[PDB]
Symmetry: C4
Subunit: 392 residues, 4 copies
């Protein structure tokens, strides 16, 4: 648990270094007023290099633990060597790899890469502004105003906006600008590429649904299906979207392993299958064999699940719809059936013609079991198969 607060402290420490090391390379007159925080931060980096072994390519941590900043600043070394103070910022590599561990289970990896990159671009912009100030001719301006002009220039460059009111006056500023321009083009390319990768996946389920609906309606239009049916199909896909988000129950349950697929099947059907009179008191092992072989099917409003006088072979279990059971002439209603009720169960005991028509009222999802799948499983429970056989 508390290691999260520690890695947030080490984030705050490396963020502190990423914002003071380049700034104190430009303004040494800031080094010592923040030396208490510097000692604390350096001791914190030293405290992290062993502690990173608790609840765990470690060279960036090893280098950032080394206090070359305190060395070059306290001894006032010349600038070309004083840049070795920047080894603290190697901790940003470790902290980015810490971020892709301590919040990658919670935050979308495309967006986490974007926030990590935007953070790096703001820290880079800060460092790049300090590089600009370092190359600028010495002048009597307030430190914040020269920094603001440098940060303005770098953001002008990195965003590729390029006003041109601040530009190189000297060769080394020009070389530096060439580098920071290429770096800004790369950074803004990474920003655009991250945002493209993120947006390309924001509604992937909805676009995948839309392209199945087009495939089905393009094909059906080629088959010259009537507008009434091609609407009972569009309305079905609208239902499947607004209920499930377009996913097939068959395809989703196949992406679960058998014990969890069984647990989900028990959670969905466990009460409704126990209350079938034909199964009353039969063993849990047999009920388990039923529920793993129940096939889902969706019926549209007004569609005939069962007619009358056809032989038939299936028993049905309402799960979210509702259903009307009707005389063979469809003139009179015998029942309304709702969630957790079943019909056609006589088809298990005898393959004989249907006594009543049955029609979905609203969109109606329900489960199906057939005398073939049923006989298959009863082949391995003779003790119940005999009961079914003698009931006829």
């Amino acid at each position: 648990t508390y290691t999260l607060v520690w890695k947030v402290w080490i984030l705050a420490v490396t963020l502190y270094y990423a914002i003071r090391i380049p700034l104190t390379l430009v303004f040494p007159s800031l080094f010592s007023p923040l030396l208490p925080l510097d000692i604390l931060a350096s001791l914190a980096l030293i405290a992290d290099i062993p502690l990173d072994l608790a609840f765990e390519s470690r060279l960036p941590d090893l280098l950032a633990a080394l206090p070359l900043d305190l060395l070059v600043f306290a001894l006032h070394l010349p600038s070309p060597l004083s840049l070795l103070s920047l080894v603290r910022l190697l901790k940003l590599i470790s902290v980015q790899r810490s971020a892709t561990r301590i919040l990658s289970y919670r935050i979308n990896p495309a967006l986490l890469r974007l926030l990590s990159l935007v953070g790096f671009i703001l820290l880079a912009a800060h460092g790049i502004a300090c590089g600009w100030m370092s190359l600028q001719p010495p002048s009597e301006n307030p430190a914040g105003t020269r920094y603001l002009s440098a940060f303005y220039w770098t953001i002008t460059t990195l965003t590729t906006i390029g006003y041109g009111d601040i530009t190189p006056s000297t060769p080394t500023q020009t070389v530096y600008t060439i580098v920071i321009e290429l770096l800004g083009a790369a950074m803004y390319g990474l920003v655009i590429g991250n945002i493209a990768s993120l947006v390309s996946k924001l509604d992937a389920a909805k676009l995948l649904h839309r392209e199945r609906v087009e495939r089905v309606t393009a094909f059906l239009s080629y088959k010259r299906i009537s507008p009434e049916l091609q609407r009972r199909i569009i309305e079905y896909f609208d239902y499947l979207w607004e209920t499930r988000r377009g996913y097939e129950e068959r395809e989703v349950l196949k992406e679960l392993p058998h014990p969890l697929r069984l647990a989900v099947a028990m959670e969905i059907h466990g009460d409704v299958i126990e209350k079938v009179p034909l199964f009353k008191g039969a063993g849990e092992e047999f009920i388990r064999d039923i529920i793993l072989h129940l096939e889902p099917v969706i019926y549209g409003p007004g569609e005939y699940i069962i007619r009358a006088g056809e032989m038939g072979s299936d028993v049905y279990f309402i799960n979210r719809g509702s259903v009307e059971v009707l005389s063979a002439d469809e003139k009179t209603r015998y029942a309304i059936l709702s969630e957790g009720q079943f019909f056609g169960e006589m088809a298990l005991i005898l393959r004989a013609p249907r006594t009543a028509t049955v029609r979905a009222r609203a969109f109606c999802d329900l489960y199906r079991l057939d005398k073939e799948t049923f006989d298959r499983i009863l082949s391995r429970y003779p003790e119940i198969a005999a009961q079914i056989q003698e009931l006829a």
Copy 2:
């Protein structure tokens, strides 16, 4: 129904606020000439917060209903606090979520996101222009000309074009520009990412088709198939594109649930299967069992559906092609067969050698049923199985 006109009115009301609140923060001398519209608009937002509960994270609506604009303007509060007038614009969140409900069934979600973003960028540009004008030194210029210069500057920034003829002259303008530059880079990154996501999916079916055609022609070239066959295959894929858009009938019908797959099968085959002499007067339940087991197959021009003297096992149903039936020597024509006609039906009653050759004329899509699949289904209709058995 009429709730659409209401949410279009609330769109017009929040669009009004998104274009007057920031403008009246710059020009208070516009506040009262539009106070009638302001009262009407505020009453409209108040009217929407309860009415949003009719045919339905509501904090943006709750905040935008609060008339902090009338408060800060009518009492002429200082600018740092007067920005609280902007709470009206929180209604844009509710109105964007209304748009992704009231036209997301009609318009492609990638393009709807793009139009929503472009709208936000134009409203943001307006607000950002007003922020620029607010930071500009007071001067005697017409209100429209200073606004035009500010809108020019913001579009120059947001599009990342950055001419530099308008640029910061002061620190607060510079900080503001840094912010608006980062915001413009982000906004233009969102625009490019939206357009990338949209274009990446404009011809997805055609590129998916092209990559199956390459897979098949790459593999066939590895197998050193003759150029004549690798053309009867390319011509088939061109046919499959220009008729169906490359979709397999098997794969499309599997993305329908059983009652609709049955209804589509009835719509395609229901007349042609009823007029088979062997099935004349057989029950609808049996015809349903036929049509669910008909397998589609496409024959290329000149290809032999049936030769002569092979034993054979299948009956065929023309659906869109045409066919020539021919003597065993292929010298003489017995028939031309077109949509809604069938041949080889003797293979159902007796597994005996074929009497006539049969060849597709144009590209020819047709359906296939075989003595194995047929016997399977007749195993569950003995009353017809006996008729078939005694006909031999």
Copy 3:
């Protein structure tokens, strides 16, 4: 055939109008020197509106046929109305839809969209340069130099480079720039999005192959498979790439319809199956049933296709590899087998132990048939089944 040359002429005619109409709106002193070409071009557009019905939302063609250009120019109408000359450019819509018909079978649709867009951007840039010149103060400069400055400005804007050496001096130029900046951001966003969509699909087969190789090597590393096997697997995937481009023969043949899948099977196996002694003189219908049930399998170098003394059940057909047949002790070579040769064929006639070991030399692709699949098909050819039965 020749309609291609006609639509290329109509391309040249609409390209002519897209480059003269906006230019003559700026320089009327060019209208009449090109009036012969104008009459020819207008007659050509009039000639196309009926001829578009030969070998075929027609409003763009209908509008572009109307000679409002000859009307507004020859009568020297004021500029706000003279813009109606631009109706010729509506033909670009028809010509883009002609391009996505007359070369979309040949050119990748992502790249065809890119070339169509780049063409539109160059034509738009031309028109936008003319709009700039129209808004420019009247001055004594050569027509080409003012055009070059305007085309420089527009390309500076559209590419979002934005030097700022040419910028608005007046309100209408500023409004126009705001529009052309938003249009340039949109156009360059379309360019980047097109290029992103194109590059995202340049090596799709190779990246799909790479991600199966990673899935297999990640999983195998989790299973702690030895480095020697995880190399016989990487070498297999390198072979499968450099021969086939990573495609499974099973998956490719399933994307062909039965008559073409049969024709491909005949082309691959038709000679090698005819020369099996057990099948010599058996009917083509039976050979067809063999070749549709041959299963491909790849053997790596040095791998044992057959050992000795195991019972075995399969006959094998070399298709591209080579094989060594070896004594049961592996000490002595009986044969080298190459493309179009077969082994283990005794497994069809009798399920008895293998007499010789067999090992792939190089990577070796070959086909497999087994006594189970063989018996299945012989169940429907008793006339050959008896011959096989009595041969033992």
Copy 4:
């Protein structure tokens, strides 16, 4: 082997030409001091055109072998013709196609395209800077300073930053800028598109995993599954990610050919199946038939692999988990079982009720074989089937 060093030398030679040919077109006073390297480089290109035939659209190599550079420079030809020296740079086409051969097995093709493009953009920038210098008015500035200003201008243009402090002063510079602006927009579009294609695929496995987890949790929420189960499912997917990276063992083994799928099955199960008492001393052919039909299944912590008193049909093989075997009342522990141990093996010899309950301790992956799959394979090994039959 050593051909790698040669193609790296030819890379260094074409890189030399890509950086001297355009530079010596601007500064002829550099031609002869580097003539030794020029002769060596030209001889190297001549040496490569035959040697490219060793361990192998050759027009770029043929043209680059021709020494038109030595011709135009040593004879001091006028600039419009002297540009023919650039034919050396056609070797970059050959060297890019060499790079996509000699490191495309090692480096991701999306990133290899990016590095190849960035290299081309830096070489193009160099050439474009030389074109700028060529069009610049003659002046007394050091060669490096004028080059630095030209390279600054080109990078300013290509990155689309466009400061505008260096801009055209003449018509030919303006035309050249228009071209280089369009080229820079195209190049930076290719950079952004490459980076988009690369980032879109950086965590493809993790986003594919996330979208199955959403599909399963969206569907389960629609089915109103309890939060306790929808957590035993999320915890399972977290386990499947952190162990395997979300891949199904079934789907991965199906992407191997039979001999390697067998070798992997032998590597995973070969010791644990040999040590089953029922299989002790049975032939390798039969063990091979077992291991190809073992089905993997993952059990979550605390889940019941076996209860007691159910009939049961399966034997299980622990592969990475651990398991507790428990009395029928679950009060007492009989065993802890770990990797390479098996249980329930009595289900092979007799389909009789289970004697002890069995529960996964941690997340537990293990393999399953059932009396049905077992009987199927024993149907083809009567010599062992008799032993199993008589053991009861």
